[PDB]
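Schema walkthrough. Field components (list of strings):
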Amino acid sequence: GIVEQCCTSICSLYQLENYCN
Amino acid sequence: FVNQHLCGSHLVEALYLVCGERGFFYTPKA
Ligand SMILES: [Cl-]
Ligand SMILES: [Cl-]
Ligand SMILES: [Cl-]
Ligand SMILES: [Zn+2]
Ligand SMILES: [Zn+2]
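Field assembly_structure (string):
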């Protein structure tokens, strides 16, 4: 999930918008 | 090991800024 995708490598703002409602 | 609890604290503050008024659901379990 988000923890797997964004704690070992950085997630940009465009990647993190994937998790918004 | 990667400390998922400390990373999660930061990821929820980043989601707060990126999602704004849309909001978000945060579920640790994968
Ligand atoms: Cl930290
Ligand atoms: Cl982040
Ligand atoms: Cl950040
Ligand atoms: Zn920290
Ligand atoms: Zn960050």
